[PDB]
Amino acid sequence: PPECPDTWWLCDCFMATCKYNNTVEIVKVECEPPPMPTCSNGLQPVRVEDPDGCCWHWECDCYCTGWGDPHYVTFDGLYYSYQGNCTYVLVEEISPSVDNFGVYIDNYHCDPNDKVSCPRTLIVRHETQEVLIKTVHMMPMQVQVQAVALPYKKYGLEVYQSGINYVVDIPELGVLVSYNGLSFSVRLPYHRFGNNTKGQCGTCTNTTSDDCILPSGEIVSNCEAAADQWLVNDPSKPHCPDCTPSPLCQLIKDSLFAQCHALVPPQHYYDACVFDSCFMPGSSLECASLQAYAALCAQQNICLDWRNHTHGACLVECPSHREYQACGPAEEPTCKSSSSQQNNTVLVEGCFCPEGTMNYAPGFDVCVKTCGCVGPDNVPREFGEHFEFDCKNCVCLEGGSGIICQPKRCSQKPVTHCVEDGTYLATEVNPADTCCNITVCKCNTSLCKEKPSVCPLGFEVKSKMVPGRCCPFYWCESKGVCVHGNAEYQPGSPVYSSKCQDCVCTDKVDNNTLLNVIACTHVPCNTSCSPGFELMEAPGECCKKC
Amino acid sequence: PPECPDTWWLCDCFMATCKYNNTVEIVKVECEPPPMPTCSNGLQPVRVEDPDGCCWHWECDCYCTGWGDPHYVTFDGLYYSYQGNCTYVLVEEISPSVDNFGVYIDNYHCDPNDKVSCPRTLIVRHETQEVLIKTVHMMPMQVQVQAVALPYKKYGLEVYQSGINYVVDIPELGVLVSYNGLSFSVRLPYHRFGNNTKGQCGTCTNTTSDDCILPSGEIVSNCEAAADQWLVNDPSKPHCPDCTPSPLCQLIKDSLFAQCHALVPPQHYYDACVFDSCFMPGSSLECASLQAYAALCAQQNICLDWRNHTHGACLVECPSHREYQACGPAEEPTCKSSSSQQNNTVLVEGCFCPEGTMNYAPGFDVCVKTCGCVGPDNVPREFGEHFEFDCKNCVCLEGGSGIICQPKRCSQKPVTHCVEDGTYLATEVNPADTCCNITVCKCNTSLCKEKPSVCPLGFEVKSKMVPGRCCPFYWCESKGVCVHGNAEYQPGSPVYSSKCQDCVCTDKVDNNTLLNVIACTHVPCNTSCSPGFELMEAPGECCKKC
Ligand SMILES: *[C@@H]1O[C@H](CO[C@@H]2O[C@@H](C)[C@@H](O)[C@@H](O)[C@@H]2O)[C@@H](O[C@@H]2O[C@H](CO)[C@@H](O[C@@H]3O[C@H](CO[C@H]4O[C@H](CO)[C@@H](O)[C@H](O)[C@@H]4O[C@@H]4O[C@H](CO)[C@@H](O[C@@H]5O[C@H](CO)[C@H](O)[C@H](O)[C@H]5O)[C@H](O)[C@H]4NC(C)=O)[C@@H](O)[C@H](O[C@H]4O[C@H](CO)[C@@H](O)[C@H](O)[C@@H]4O[C@@H]4O[C@H](CO)[C@@H](O[C@@H]5O[C@H](CO)[C@H](O)[C@H](O)[C@H]5O)[C@H](O)[C@H]4NC(C)=O)[C@@H]3O)[C@H](O)[C@H]2NC(C)=O)[C@H](O)[C@H]1NC(C)=O
Ligand SMILES: *[C@@H]1O[C@H](CO[C@@H]2O[C@@H](C)[C@@H](O)[C@@H](O)[C@@H]2O)[C@@H](O[C@@H]2O[C@H](CO)[C@@H](O[C@@H]3O[C@H](CO[C@H]4O[C@H](CO)[C@@H](O)[C@H](O)[C@@H]4O[C@@H]4O[C@H](CO)[C@@H](O[C@@H]5O[C@H](CO)[C@H](O)[C@H](O)[C@H]5O)[C@H](O)[C@H]4NC(C)=O)[C@@H](O)[C@H](O[C@H]4O[C@H](CO)[C@@H](O)[C@H](O)[C@@H]4O[C@@H]4O[C@H](CO)[C@@H](O[C@@H]5O[C@H](CO)[C@H](O)[C@H](O)[C@H]5O)[C@H](O)[C@H]4NC(C)=O)[C@@H]3O)[C@H](O)[C@H]2NC(C)=O)[C@H](O)[C@H]1NC(C)=O
Ligand SMILES: *[C@@H]1O[C@H](CO[C@@H]2O[C@@H](C)[C@@H](O)[C@@H](O)[C@@H]2O)[C@@H](O[C@@H]2O[C@H](CO)[C@@H](O[C@@H]3O[C@H](CO[C@H]4O[C@H](CO)[C@@H](O)[C@H](O)[C@@H]4O[C@@H]4O[C@H](CO)[C@@H](O[C@@H]5O[C@H](CO)[C@H](O)[C@H](O)[C@H]5O)[C@H](O)[C@H]4NC(C)=O)[C@@H](O)[C@H](O[C@H]4O[C@H](CO)[C@@H](O)[C@H](O)[C@@H]4O[C@@H]4O[C@H](CO)[C@@H](O[C@@H]5O[C@H](CO)[C@H](O)[C@H](O)[C@H]5O)[C@H](O)[C@H]4NC(C)=O)[C@@H]3O)[C@H](O)[C@H]2NC(C)=O)[C@H](O)[C@H]1NC(C)=O
Ligand SMILES: *[C@@H]1O[C@H](CO)[C@@H](O[C@@H]2O[C@H](CO)[C@@H](O[C@@H]3O[C@H](CO[C@H]4O[C@H](CO)[C@@H](O)[C@H](O)[C@@H]4O[C@@H]4O[C@H](CO)[C@@H](O[C@@H]5O[C@H](CO)[C@H](O)[C@H](O)[C@H]5O)[C@H](O)[C@H]4NC(C)=O)[C@@H](O)[C@H](O[C@H]4O[C@H](CO)[C@@H](O)[C@H](O)[C@@H]4O[C@@H]4O[C@H](CO)[C@@H](O[C@@H]5O[C@H](CO)[C@H](O)[C@H](O)[C@H]5O)[C@H](O)[C@H]4NC(C)=O)[C@@H]3O)[C@H](O)[C@H]2NC(C)=O)[C@H](O)[C@H]1NC(C)=O
Ligand SMILES: *[C@@H]1O[C@H](CO[C@@H]2O[C@@H](C)[C@@H](O)[C@@H](O)[C@@H]2O)[C@@H](O[C@@H]2O[C@H](CO)[C@@H](O[C@@H]3O[C@H](CO)[C@@H](O)[C@H](O)[C@@H]3O)[C@H](O)[C@H]2NC(C)=O)[C@H](O)[C@H]1NC(C)=O
Numbered sequence A, B: 001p002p003e004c005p006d007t008w009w010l011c012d013c014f015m016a017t018c019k020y021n022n023t024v025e026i027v028k029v030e031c032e033p034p035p036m037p038t039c040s041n042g043l044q045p046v047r048v049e050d051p052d053g054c055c056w057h058w059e060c061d062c063y064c065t066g067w068g069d070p071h072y073v074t075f076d077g078l079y080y081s082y083q084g085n086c087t088y089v090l091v092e093e094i095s096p097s098v099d100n101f102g103v104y105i106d107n108y109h110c111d112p113n114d115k116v117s118c119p120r121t122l123i124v125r126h127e128t129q130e131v132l133i134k135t136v137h138m139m140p141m142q143v144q145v146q147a148v149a150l151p152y153k154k155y156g157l158e159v160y161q162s163g164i165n166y167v168v169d170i171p172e173l174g175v176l177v178s179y180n181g182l183s184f185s186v187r188l189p190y191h192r193f194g195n196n197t198k199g200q201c202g203t204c205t206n207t208t209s210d211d212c213i214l215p216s217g218e219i220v221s222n223c224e225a226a227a228d229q230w231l232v233n234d235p236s237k238p239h240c241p242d243c244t245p246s247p248l249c250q251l252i253k254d255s256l257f258a259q260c261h262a263l264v265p266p267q268h269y270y271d272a273c274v275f276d277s278c279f280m281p282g283s284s285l286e287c288a289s290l291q292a293y294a295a296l297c298a299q300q301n302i303c304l305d306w307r308n309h310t311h312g313a314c315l316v317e318c319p320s321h322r323e324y325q326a327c328g329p330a331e332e333p334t335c336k337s338s339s340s341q342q343n344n345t346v347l348v349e350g351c352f353c354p355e356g357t358m359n360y361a362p363g364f365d366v367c368v369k370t371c372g373c374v375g376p377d378n379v380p381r382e383f384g385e386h387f388e389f390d391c392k393n394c395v396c397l398e399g400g401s402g403i404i405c406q407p408k409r410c411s412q413k414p415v416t417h418c419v420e421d422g423t424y425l426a427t428e429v430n431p432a433d434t435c436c437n438i439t440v441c442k443c444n445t446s447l448c449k450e451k452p453s454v455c456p457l458g459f460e461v462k463s464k465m466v467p468g469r470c471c472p473f474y475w476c477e478s479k480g481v482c483v484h485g486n487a488e489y490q491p492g493s494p495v496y497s498s499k500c501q502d503c504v505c506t507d508k509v510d511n512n513t514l515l516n517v518i519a520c521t522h523v524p525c526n527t528s529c530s531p532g533f534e535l536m537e538a539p540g541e542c543c544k545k546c
């Protein structure tokens, strides 16, 4: 046919006006618009491709930032300071395109006035799920509808970490939210969200004039007052109502940030630093705006180290196994699956594993040189290594599931007999293996079956005492004295057996004699008298010289 | 330009002729060849697209199968039976396109005849890696260069399970190797491997005639004789040199397999079944060909349940928490990675978790209903559940890394020994606590001065003895039979304090006679002696009868 049998945008923008099916006037279409001048934000615009492959126009992203306690900068580079306590809406939608979508910021319900214990909580609602990021004295935690871990992904919503920031993103909508504990940033694409947002972050129109509107939809010159009207009522608390310039603030104007003076306007941050320093001196509150300026510069592909120059008073506090770096990868290379990924170009600050080692896997913190397995207890393991974890036999081997554990089945030789009286069979904690639980011939002294063996007065000590046996043996109660003197043999027993017996054995010490000194010196001898005749051996006679 | 400003193949499978730059002579080309009637395999050819998107030809995949001990069928539907005991090569490349690519079957080296646990062993060598798949009585094991786990993936080589088969594949080349313990299968694409393969599986030439070739490279008629010369050399074992047709084989021609009689040639398997039955009756060796026939039918998207009609003698044996299904998904759904639907749409046989439950994750075996966490000890866990795994406080919460564990931080008995002499601090692990040695007082009888109170006499027992303290309390060695007596108050000491006395001591107790049984008896008296008298009670005058 003279007109083409679809005269068409046939391919690769090869457009056409067909004279006939065979002979047509084909056309080719291409173009290139110059880089847009600016976006009332100083940030360089990006390239957005047409639906048609023919061309790409320049459009710049929507960026809202909030730092310090009161400091806000909207999507179009308008800056203002607002103070409040009740939770406030950050960004919402004018015409609902996504169900229950919104970003909110509770600034003081957690900590009113001074936010020293907890500065803010960030609420992100997307359809079914809501995420509340809150901070405490040492490290923030997040609650999803219940607490969760950091590397979270569910229903197109992802939460993770990057440098010193907690990032909540929706890839389908391209929404990025970064929380720091001292500031927050919201990043939105232009085409998806163009002139359809409202809240304290203003309207992403590329115009600074319409950057604040009331919920009704009016325009007010006093942009600070419009922020106070963006209050979200909730069940709890329904009764919502001379300066010497510190040199630190001078760091913005120094030559260190001279590279940042291009591609990023420094007027707002310097004024915020000066105001914070004059609010009260010597509180280390003026090195919070510097962090935001450095973060924005890094986002602008300009990485700088500045904290060195701050003479301390605010640094990073992360554990020993990590070292602080001003320029580092946004996504650290975990050993588990670094694989291949688009290396982005913006190096962010933070603290990472040392140069020699590297992180193990997402959700872990142990840095290792050559990674094998990591169990629930953070201890590095090598491939083909045998270690008794818990009460089991476990092995780290290459493949899936890592650790493989099997039961212990420890056994001991069962002995029931207990020979000594003290020995009594008792199963008890196996000392070597708390799990083996081996039984043992326990020892009770009370169960001593044999009894003390009484001995004669003569013996001294059975020596059985403290034998060290399960049953304590007993020493002999008797002792060495001339016991076997006479009759019932005891220590003196010098009964007068002789007609003139002396034998006064007084336990006189002698070999065997001590035990038995028969010191008998009878004197049965008879001595004459002047008239007592026949006195030789007469009854009861003793020597008598008379 | 009148000459086309590159008359050329226009993009999008179009073409052009050019006598004008815009007014050109446009063309477009395409086709639909009839499906190749057959491919000498009985298998339907697959659609292979050209480089450019213009046309799709019908080339049939290369499939090599071998079941039982001696049976083999080449890539082109040629069948032969070969018996051998040393390792043989299945497929290798005539022109080396991939470094160190090969498949080897080790037959009989591990089990010579009457396989005790390993019928054979597969060796798949690809570049730097080699994989050895071996079997034992109940589960196969794989060694990768040392042992590895089941879900293995490294350097473009992947090893996993599917139904009852172990699958080794290289996604870059499309090579598939399936092992079962009773058979094996090799699947190769045509374009990558055409007229470049050699070995026992033959030439994937699409002609049965050229399938068998000597290692030198000749053509011979008998495939079996050539197969014997495909032997590879290793340091190990370097010295390599009445039939009643059972109804089980008759199941092949039954109406159950009627769908398989088309689209799949059933002659070879039936002949193999008959020959195996004739080899020895009643040994359950004739239900291995049925398995391969059913597997090939299932590969053709035709699932059949047949083991129910075998009247036993060969079924599956997998643990109780899994039930056998003749038609199920090749890749079972696991909660960790539900991701997208499995469009495999071929229902391989095997055994899976029951319909109520679902498998937890790859590399795991526990079937669960609502998945939470699974630690090294295979126990299901719920979200927000607190347990005492190892000696730690651990929690299962949804997110990254699953289980979060922290130290027990066990408290201790604050005691200083104890005041009992003998006590020494033990700081021991109270059975009530676990992993918690706490200070405890350890009375030591060896470490006591029990101050034995030496009693002079008559004290039958001090009675300190054993009262419940570890100190060895003291009994008193003394006893009172004759505490009194001139002889140092010795017991049984009857001596005349006065020569005229008896003081009889029988050592008796009585009432205080235990202290003084001797008491005394007065012998003295004087009576009438010779006239003239004057005896005057002559001193020493004890009772006389003068
Ligand atoms: C950081 O920080 C720091 C501090 O400061 C602070 O901060 C800042 C930021 C600001 O703010 C301020 O203001 C504050 O205060 C700073 O500092 C600086 O540094 C630098 C560097 O370093 C320097 O310069 C240099 O240095 C060197 C050494 O270093 C050292 O020292 C220093 C001082 O001086 C310091 O600072 C540092 O830190 C260091 O320290 C050290 O450390 C070590 C360790 O590591 C140690 O060691 C130790 O000890 C012992 C000994 O050694 C043992 O044995 C061992 O070893 C260990 O243990 C040491 O001791 C320490 N030291 C000290 C003293 O401290 C030096 O040496 C030099 O000297 C030089 O000069 C001369 C003349 O010319 C010559 O003769 C010589 O030879 C030399 O040379 C040189 O070299 C160097 C090095 O390289 C250089 O430096 C550098 O370089 C580079 C290259 O590339 C670049 O250029 C840069 O820029 C630079 O700087 C130089 O330059 C050269 N020179 C020539 C021309 O030659 C010197 O001294 C400075 O001085 C400083 N200052 C201060 C103030 O201090 C920083 O800067 C920061 N950073 C950042 C990042 O920012
Ligand atoms: C040997 O070894 C051992 C150790 O070892 C262990 O154990 C064993 C069994 C096994 O198991 C193994 O294995 C292991 O390892 C030992 O044990 C120990 O001991 C200790 C010492 O002894 C103790 O502590 C303490 O003790 C005391 C005494 O003792 C006793 O007991 C025990 C237990 O507990 C035993 O064991 C022993 O043997 C003894 O026994 C007894 O004894 C008693 C005394 O003699 C007797 O009694 C008698 O009789 C009658 C009654 O019956 C009468 O009446 C009187 O009483 C007496 O005469 C008994 O009979 C027996 N039994 C048997 C069975 O034998 C104790 O006493 C103590 O306790 C107490 O105190 C406390 C304080 O605090 C309290 O609380 C409590 O309650 C009590 O009190 C009273 O007491 C009494 C007496 O005893 C009673 O009665 C009786 O008891 C018994 C016990 O057994 C039984 O029950 C009977 O039935 C009943 O009747 C009451 O009841 C009570 N109550 C009240 C009223 O209060 C403490 O106990 C420990 O404990 C132990 N442990 C164990 C576990 O056992 C052993 O000893 C050895 N042995 C030998 C011989 O050596
Ligand atoms: C209580 O307390 C007590 C005290 O008290 C006392 O005593 C008593 C009995 C009573 O009498 C009371 O009265 C008095 O007071 C105590 O005990 C003690 O202990 C301590 C500690 O242990 C000791 O120390 C030691 O020493 C030594 C010397 O000496 C010794 O020896 C001798 C002979 O020679 C003898 O005689 C003595 O006795 C002694 O012995 C001893 O003993 C103990 C007790 O028993 C013992 O302990 C214990 O034991 C048990 C059983 O029974 C078990 O065995 C346990 O385990 C243990 O612990 C000891 O052992 C023993 N020893 C001996 C020798 O015998 C020295 O020598 C020593 O040193 C050593 O040892 C140590 C540990 O112990 C160590 O550490 C060191 O190093 C050393 O080493 C040694 O070396 C030696 C030489 O060579 C040896 O020997 C020999 O060896 C061989 C091989 O080579 C073989 O075995 C043979 O058999 C052997 O003999 C050894 O063995 C080694 N050892 C080791 C392990 O190493 C120490 O220093 C003391 O002495 C004691 N004392 C007594 C007398 O006894 C307790 O203990 C307490 N507790 C409770 C019971 O409660
Ligand atoms: C792998 O193994 C498979 C199983 O063996 C095999 O599948 C089929 O195998 C059959 C048996 O081998 C095979 O049958 C053919 O038989 C021919 C001899 O008899 C035929 O020719 C005489 C006249 O010479 C004729 O009287 C008689 O009736 C037969 O007619 C033939 O019928 C064929 C089947 O319909 C037909 O092939 C079909 O062509 C279709 C075209 O749209 C379509 O592609 C179908 O898919 C295809 O099957 C064939 O064209 C026709 N011939 C004529 C002239 O009537 C053999 O000659 C023939 O071998 C040739 O074909 C196979 C592929 O089929 C080639 O591999 C092989 O190299 C031969 O190449 C052929 O060469 C002849 C001579 O030059 C060509 O004849 C010309 O045809 C022109 C029109 O197309 C024109 O008339 C010219 O004047 C003729 O000279 C012929 O076209 C060439 N074919 C091709 C495609 O190369 C074959 O053995 C059957 O064809 C096989 N079908 C397929 C594709 O599966 C499979 O082929 C094997 N594959 C490979 C890679 O080897
Ligand atoms: C990203 O991609 C690579 C670097 O790889 C990146 O960082 C790794 C640590 C991993 O995280 C990766 O997942 C991640 O993508 C770089 O692109 C270019 O790579 C080649 C090496 O393949 C560099 O060498 C160049 O090319 C050849 C050598 O292959 C030679 O001509 C020269 O050696 C030449 O230098 C190349 O330099 C590098 N690109 C640059 C900087 O020119 C790069 O870091 C980055 N590229 C992107 C994202 O475009």
Ligand SMILES: *[C@@H]1O[C@H](CO[C@@H]2O[C@@H](C)[C@@H](O)[C@@H](O)[C@@H]2O)[C@@H](O[C@@H]2O[C@H](CO)[C@@H](O[C@@H]3O[C@H](CO)[C@@H](O)[C@H](O)[C@@H]3O)[C@H](O)[C@H]2NC(C)=O)[C@H](O)[C@H]1NC(C)=O
Residues within 6 Å of the ligand: B510, B511, B512
């Ligand atoms: C034997 O002794 C017991 C007391 O127990 C003993 O006391 C010393 C002799 C010790 O050396 C040990 O041998 C032993 O511990 C007498 O039992 C009782 O004694 C008391 C005190 O004398 C009597 O009380 C008296 O009773 C009299 C009247 O009988 C009164 O006149 C006194 O004023 C006083 O109340 C008590 O009655 C008595 N009871 C008994 C059991 O008789 C025991 O009498 C005595 N027997 C002998 C052999 O004399």
Ligand SMILES: *[C@@H]1O[C@H](CO)[C@@H](O)[C@H](O)[C@H]1NC(C)=O
Residues within 6 Å of the ligand: A001, A002, A020, A021, A022, A023
């Ligand atoms: C294509 O165009 C030529 C020139 O007009 C004409 O002669 C021919 O018939 C056309 N063919 C078709 C299919 O329109």
Ligand SMILES: *[C@@H]1O[C@H](CO)[C@@H](O)[C@H](O)[C@H]1NC(C)=O
Residues within 6 Å of the ligand: A024, A025, A026, B001, B002, B003, B019, B020, B021, B022, B023
């Ligand atoms: C170029 O295109 C025009 C319009 O179709 C045609 O008239 C002319 O002949 C073409 N050839 C030349 C001169 O490039």
Ligand SMILES: [Ca+2]
Residues within 6 Å of the ligand: A076, A202, A203, A204, A205, A206, A207, A208, A209, A210, A211
């Ligand atoms: Ca605006």
Ligand SMILES: [Ca+2]
Residues within 6 Å of the ligand: B076, B202, B203, B204, B205, B206, B207, B208, B209, B210, B211
């Ligand atoms: Ca062939």
